[PDB]
Amino acid sequence: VHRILNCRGTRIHAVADSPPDQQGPLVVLLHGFPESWYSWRHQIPALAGAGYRVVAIDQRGYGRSSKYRVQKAYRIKELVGDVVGVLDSYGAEQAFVVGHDWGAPVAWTFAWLHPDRCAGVVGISVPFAGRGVIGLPGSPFGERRPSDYHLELAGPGRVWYQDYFAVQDGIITEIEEDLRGWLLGLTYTVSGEGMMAATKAAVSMDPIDVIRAGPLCMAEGARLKDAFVYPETMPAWFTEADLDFYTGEFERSGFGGPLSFYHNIDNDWHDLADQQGKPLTPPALFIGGQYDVGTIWGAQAIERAHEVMPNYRGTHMIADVGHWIQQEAPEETNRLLLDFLGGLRP
Amino acid sequence: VHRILNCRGTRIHAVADSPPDQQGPLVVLLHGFPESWYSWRHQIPALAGAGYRVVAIDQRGYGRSSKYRVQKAYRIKELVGDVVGVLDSYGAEQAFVVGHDWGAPVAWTFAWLHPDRCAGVVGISVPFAGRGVIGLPGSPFGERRPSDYHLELAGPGRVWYQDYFAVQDGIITEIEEDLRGWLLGLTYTVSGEGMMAATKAAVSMDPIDVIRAGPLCMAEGARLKDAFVYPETMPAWFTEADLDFYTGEFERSGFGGPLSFYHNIDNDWHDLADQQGKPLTPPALFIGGQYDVGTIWGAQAIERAHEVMPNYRGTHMIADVGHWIQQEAPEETNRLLLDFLGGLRP
């Protein structure tokens, strides 16, 4: 189950599963922020049962994988290089790569830069955004600079959460005061039930300005934790045992490495200029969430999927669920993945 | 056994043990670099059996305790403030504090700044060095600036390991390539058997220049790992199960927080100027190691112990053991601690 891979000097921890014959196409699962290989707990058994060799890693800076302090260790191409190291560890020429949240940009970019090593790519929550890394209502494919675009058009005297994350000072401070409660807050808030309830509190305008006056949008000097919402009772899809797992991983790893991902966005947008225009050629698929903020912000990037991905095999919207897509709708997600992989050849 | 304390916003994890009545003087154990509460595994049961409430914490940046990225979170007074939070969690007016390696400066400084909360202090490996934090053959009490004093007088075109550690770039890179082997290397190298063997390779000069041409002294552009020595077989005091524990803690925590300790030395020396002169008044004790580099470098600070500590209850030298003092000589160390605590009143 547990494996330690050496990806050209970087220790990458992973949880594997496959048919007893130890044969089948390789499927790599990339988790996002602030998650773990554990986020794919409902897919691993399904994919392995369908005949695939499934590998769910802890990205660098997470769980039991290498923890770097320097910022350059968390640039998109380093993340991508880790995925390449995974395939190399399994001696696999190609592999299906599935990424969620931050895992998606890495999976998308992995397919963009290494189409020869990719049999298919699936981004969950966050649609392909080219050099944009993360598509937003204003810039679906990174038309403008990430940082500055955040500043203006995102809040008068407010702060874009991503830029807050990138600071890695106050964000960490508000987390450590009570890490377990922070995880619960951030989870329930951008979840389905949490979003439906936040909307139910209607008491409809332009989406581009809905971000402001939103949770991920805070007033300068405040704390992102200030806008969280906690459930009266632990949702059925995210129990106490799940929260205890995640809590245990992060009280050991911290958020330093994870937050450096956000800190390098501008740097990623930079590193990916020499790719704009070039299409993403592997067969691609996007799974979005009705109430997921990732799906909503990349709405413009999704309408133009075929414009950037010739082998785009389609968009799939899961209703009533929020950001934690593969956990909130484990079986719907499994069906979609099994269909996509099923109709493709390794 | 395991406890999670809230030290004024900082999560401090600890392993406790005490008489069933849950009464007895409080004894706080502070580990060093790159260690864990686990380093005191042989003392915990002994101290608890002698009637003491023993608390062995993971310092911030370690194990399951809060992980900060900003450098100021790792300044001496922050570390000291954590110890104060520990006593406060147990509602203890006073406590005996025992620290090893990096744990010693924190214990010494804790006694220096909060004599009213300290019933006694014991530094192991690293003798009290005042604003010096870590006493060296040249500067026993921080007479000169730490950083610059490192540069000159420590190697022509060489590098002082502490300044290397402080960089937190290449040091971490050489660690992550193979973390488990790095721990073994660093451990065996500065251990007793490792030092005796390194000396046995005689084929005696001034100590102040023995540092150079030494393990902790590397040539610019090289890697500290380049000078390590590995054992043919795991020493009897540091087995594979021990190495597996430590390996597991650090592959999860990383070395970022830990190395920030070294990075802040100059800053500590600065923060502690307003203390020079003032004596350390709690009853104090130092346990050194014949082959321990900490004991050797602070040789000048130990000869002048009574000059800075009026209640200095004595120096104790354990022979044949190296730097990992309480693990290499668990019972000798227990006797010394039990004698010191035994003759004092909580």
Q: Which residue has the tokens 């502490």?
A: B162
Search chain B and give the residue with CA nearest A9.
B177
Report chain B residues whose CB lies below 8 A from the CB of A178.
6
Asked if B270 is an active-site residue, the reply is no
* Torsion (CA) A30, A32, A38, A41 in degrees, nearest 10: -70
Q: Which CA distances in Å does B128 have to A120, A292, B122, B176?
A: 61, 56, 9, 32
Of B101, B242, B266, B292, catalytic: B101
Closest CA to A35 of A225, A291, A257: A257
- How many angstroms separate the CA atoms of B135 and B207, rounded? 14
- How many angstroms separate the CA atoms of B292 and B295, rounded? 5
- How many angstroms separate the CA atoms of B105 and B101, rounded? 8
Report chain A residues whose CB lies below 8 A from the CB of B58.
none
CATH of B1-346, one of 3.40.605.10, 3.60.40.10, 3.40.50.720, 3.40.50.1820: 3.40.50.1820
- How many angstroms separate the CA atoms of A93 and A280, rounded? 18
Q: What does this entry list as its resolution, in Å?
A: 2.1
**Which H or E run contains A56?**
strand A53-57
**Which H or E run contains A13?**
strand A10-17
The number of beta carbons lying within 10 Å of the beta carbon of residue B4 is 14
Search chain B and give the residue with CA nearest A66.
B176
Report chain B residues whose CB lies below 8 A from the CB of A66.
176, 179, 251, 254
A177/chain B closest Cα distance in angstroms: 4
Closest CA to A97 of A107, A87, A88, A105: A107
- How many angstroms separate the CA atoms of B13 and A184, rounded? 20
Report chain A residues whose CB lies below 8 A from the CB of B68.
172-173, 176, 254, 256
Asked if B325 and B334 count as a contact pair (C-beta separation under 8 A), the reply is no
Closest CA to A229 of A266, A201, A269, A250: A201
3-state secondary structure chain B: CEEEEEECCEEEEEEEECCCCCCCCEEEEECCCCCCHHHHCCCHHHHHHCCCEEEEECCCCCCCCCCCCCHHHHCHHHHHHHHHHHHHHCCCCCEEEEEECCHHHHHHHHHHHCHHHEEEEEEECCCCCHHHCCCCCCCCCCCCCHHHHHHCCCCCCEEEHHHHHHHCCHHHHHHHCCHHHHHHHHHHHCCHHHHHHHHHCCCCCCHHHCCCCCCCEEECCCCHHHHCCCCCCCCCCCCHHHHHHHHHHHHHHCCHHHHHHHHCHHHHHHHCHHHCCCCCCCCEEEEEECCCHHHHHCHHHHHCHHHHCCCEEEEEEECCCCCCHHHHCHHHHHHHHHHHHHCCCC
| Region label for A168, one of left (φ > 0), alpha (ψ between -120 and 50) or beta (otherwise) | left
| Phi and psi, residue B70, nearest 5° | -60, 145
Cα atoms in the Cβ-side hemisphere of radius 13 Å centred on A261: 24
- How many angstroms separate the CA atoms of B192 and B290, rounded? 8
Domain segments of chain A: what residues? Answer: 1-346
Asked if A36 and A249 count as a contact pair (C-beta separation under 8 A), the reply is yes
Asked if B316 is an active-site residue, the reply is no
DSSP state of A189: H
- How many angstroms separate the CA atoms of B203 and A132, rounded? 62
- Spacing of C-alpha B129 from chain mean position: 13
3-state SS, residue A122: strand
Cα-only R_g, chain A: 19
Give chain A's count of helices (H) and strands (E).
16, 10
Which of A65, A66, A179 faces B11 most closely, judged by CB atoms?
A179
